[PDB]
């Protein structure tokens, strides 16, 4: 049975909220809505996240790297009881959207920050690892600077964050250890929503560098005096070594997309290992072959069709089920347009999957002891992907509108 005080606030984006259970190693992921959906709509929506996880993302990213635990039902009093308790924990910016309190459904997943031994967990939101290559783009700046580094200017000017991050995803997504070190230092300096650190299921950093060292010193140095620089450097190196870790150097990927350059970004102040999670993530991100500029015309062709034929929306699995036939249709990587709805639709569904891979999080576990990297302790490590719900069909015009603004505003600033 469910107890209000046994669950604690863990985190949120702007689609969902997560609460971790103090005893068992599980979390519950709840949806979020404004004060202004049906119970059935939520059930399918939540079940679509599991189907998409099982039937699409386990193929692209691997069975062991993905965990999308089943949908679960709860009593409506418990959800209310929990909601009010936690309201103070939530940061004030997220509080526009309220918690899913009326449905009584949520998604139960394993807590990737918890599992007598201690545990250190680093969560990263790496963002898009390539600079767009497509001839459909009408701004030449998009071929030079990454989305992330461009986007940074508008976010700081808007007052989202205090200053521009030096993190460029192409530094992290390169194979080069020196570039990967610089990227991780840059995330440590200016965390934003791209870095978080947990110790025994407790957040300890990215919503002070010397305060981090207090917490991390027991791990890497379980007596010699070790300064902050020493502690933070070994965190950077171990993590770099976990991101360069691959268990599948030989096998052929489901997506064999080629990295069309450039591999260095201008805004940033011999490639990834074949089986590593960062490589595999980058491959599913590259399903965006056309760019939004690009893809948006093909969105209109599909919309035009669906407005003519409303019944076919369910028929063509636009909002699921995200099943084996859905997966199979993503494998047509041909970029030659034949003016057909089928072509446009294929590219639209591929673009949504790429959007999902561009906004996903990577959770790295570390525990002192299977799979082990070199360190001044002896650490057993695990890797996971988080935040793999398919991005909606309806947001594609928003991506087109936003992309224009990011590039134009950057082009003004430079
Ligand atoms: O606006 P984008 O493209 O940078 O990405 C959004 C993210 O913005 P960010 O740049 O990471 O601050 C945004 O993150 P924040 O809530 O702004 O931290 C979300 O991840 C959003 O995804 P969803 O629609 O909530 O599932 C993301 O929305 P999508 O565009 O992926 O739908
Ligand atoms: N299984 C899990 N184990 C541990 N922490 C988790 C788990 N799932 C989610 N979290 C935490 O909860 C946070 C919010 O969840 P999540 O990012 O998946 O939702 P979201 O609303 O889709 O966010 P986003 O804005 O990034 O799209 C994560 O950033 C992470 O810190
Ligand atoms: Mg997230
Ligand atoms: Mg999301
Ligand atoms: Zn960059």
CATH number at residue 80: 3.30.200.110
Using CA atoms, how far apart are residues 158 and 370, in angstroms rounded to an integer?
46
- 194 Cα to the center of ligand 3, angstroms: 9
Using CA atoms, how far apart are residues 50 and 54, in angstroms rounded to an integer?
6
Residues near 191 by Cβ (< 8 Å), separated by ≥ 6?
205, 206, 207
For residue 109, give the ligand 2 atom closest to its CA.
1
Using CA atoms, how far apart are residues 21 and 86, in angstroms rounded to an integer?
13
* Cis ω before 262 (30° cut-off from 0): yes
Q: Please, are residues 20 and 8 in contact by the beta-carbon 8 Å criterion?
A: yes
For residue 402, give the ligand 1 atom closest to its CA.
1
Which residues line ligand 1 at a C-beta cut-off of 6 Å?
13-15, 193, 355, 359, 391, 395, 399
Query: What ligand is nearest to the CA atom of residue 392?
Result: 1
Please give the residue range of the domain that contains residue 74.
7-120
Residues near 94 by Cβ (< 8 Å), separated by ≥ 6?
12, 14
Which residues line ligand 2 at a C-beta cut-off of 6 Å?
10-16, 18, 27, 29, 109-113, 123, 196, 359, 361, 386-387
- 193 Cα to the center of ligand 4, angstroms: 13
Ion ligand 3: residues, CB < 5 A: 13, 361, 387
Q: What is the resolution of this structure in A?
A: 2.4
* C-alpha closest to that of 358 among 281, 299, 295: 281
- What is the three-state SS of the chain? CCCHHHEEEEEECCCEEEEEECCCCEEEEEEEECCCCCHHHHHHHHHHHHHHHHHHHHHHHCCCCECCCCEEECCHHHHHHHHHHHCCCCCCCHHHCEECCCCCEEEEEECCCCCCCCCEEEEECCCCCCCCCCCCCCCHHHHCCCHHHHHHHHHHHHCCCCCCCCCCHHHHHCCCHHHHHHHHHHHHHCCCCCEEEEECCCECCCCCHHHHHHHHHHHHCCCCCCCHHHHHHHHHHHHHHHHCCCCCCCCCCCCCCCCCCCCCCCCCCCCCCCCCHHHHHHHHHCCCCCCHHHHHHHHHHHHHHHHHCCCHHHHCCCCCCCCHHHHHHCCCCCCCCCCCHHHHHHHHHHHHHHHHHHCCEEEEEEEECCCCCCCCCCEEEEEEEECCCCCCHHHHHHHHHHHHHHHHHHHHHC
CA-CA-CA-CA torsion sign (280, 284, 288, 292): negative
- 364 Cα to the center of ligand 4, angstroms: 19
Residue of 7, 8, 9, 11 to mutate, ligand 2, most atoms within 8 A of C-beta = 11
For residue 110, give the ligand 2 atom closest to its CA.
1
Query: What ligand is nearest to the CA atom of residue 112?
Result: 2
- 154 Cα to the center of ligand 5, angstroms: 14
- The approach used to solve this structure was X-ray
Instruction: Find the Cα–Cα–Cα–Cα dihedral 52, 58, 59, 65, rounded to 10°.
Output: 150
Using alpha carbons, list the distances in angstroms from residue 401 to 110, 132, 332, 374, 394. 37, 17, 27, 46, 13
- 385 Cα to the center of ligand 3, angstroms: 10
Residue of 14, 52, 196, 386 to mutate, ligand 1, most atoms within 8 A of C-beta = 14
Residues near 331 by Cβ (< 8 Å), separated by ≥ 6?
254
Give nearest CA residue, ligand 2 atom 31.
11
Q: How many CB atoms lie within 10 A of CB 414?
A: 8
- 233 Cα to the center of ligand 4, angstroms: 31
Query: What ligand is nearest to the CA atom of residue 387?
Result: 2
Using alpha carbons, list the distances in angstroms from residue 96 to 92, 99, 125, 223. 8, 10, 23, 50
Q: Please, are residues 234 and 220 in contact by the beta-carbon 8 Å criterion?
A: yes
């Amino acid at each position: 049975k469910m107890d209000e005080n046994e669950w604690s606030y863990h985190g949120e984006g702007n689609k969902s909220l997560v609460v971790a259970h103090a005893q068992r190693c599980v979390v519950l992921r709840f949806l979020k809505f404004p004060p202004n959906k049906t119970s059935e709509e939520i059930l399918q929506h939540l079940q679509n996240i599991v189907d998409f996880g099982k039937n699409v993302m386990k193929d692209f990213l691997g069975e062991n790297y993905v965990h999308c635990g089943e949908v679960v039902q709860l009593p409506l009093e418990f959800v209310k009881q929990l909601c009010l308790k936690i309201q103070c924990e939530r940061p004030e910016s997220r509080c526009d959207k309220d918690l899913d309190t009326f449905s009584g459904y949520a998604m139960c997943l394993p807590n990737l920050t918890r599992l007598h031994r201690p545990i250190l967990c680093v969560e990263i939101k790496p963002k898009c690892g390539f600079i767009p290559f497509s001839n459909d783009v009408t701004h030449e700046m998009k071929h030079k600077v990454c989305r992330y580094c461009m986007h940074q200017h508008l976010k700081v000017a808007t007052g989202k964050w205090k200053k521009i991050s030096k993190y460029c995803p192409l530094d992290l997504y390169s194979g080069n250890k020196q570039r990967m070190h610089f990227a991780l230092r840059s995330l440590l300096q200016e965390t934003q929503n791209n870095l978080r650190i947990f110790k025994n299921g407790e957040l300890i950093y990215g919503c002070d560098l010397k305060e981090l060292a207090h917490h991390l010193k027991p791990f890497f140095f379980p007596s010699g005096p070790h300064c902050t620089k020493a502690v933070i450097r070994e965190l950077v190196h171990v993590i770099t070594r976990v991101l360069l870790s691959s268990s599948e150097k030989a096998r052929a990927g489901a997506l064999r997309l080629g990295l069309q350059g450039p591999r260095v970004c201008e805004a940033s102040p011999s490639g990834l290992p074949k089986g590593c999670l960062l490589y595999k993530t980058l491959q599913v991100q590259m399903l965006d072959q056309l760019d939004i500029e690009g893809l948006y015309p093909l969105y209109k062709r599909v919309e035009q069709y669906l407005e003519e034929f409303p019944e076919e929306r369910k028929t063509l699995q636009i909002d699921g089920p995200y099943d084996e036939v859905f997966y199979q249709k993503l494998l047509d990587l041909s970029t030659e347009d034949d003016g057909t709805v089928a072509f446009a639709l294929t590219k639209v569904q591929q673009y949504r999957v790429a959007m999902t891979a561009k906004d996903c999080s990577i959770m790295i576990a570390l525990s002192p002891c299977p799979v082990i990297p070199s360190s001044r302790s002896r650490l057993a490590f695990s890797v996971s992907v988080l935040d793999l719900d398919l991005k909606p069909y309806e947001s594609i015009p928003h991506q087109y509108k936003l992309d224009s603004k990011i590039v134009n505003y950057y082009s003004k600033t430079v």
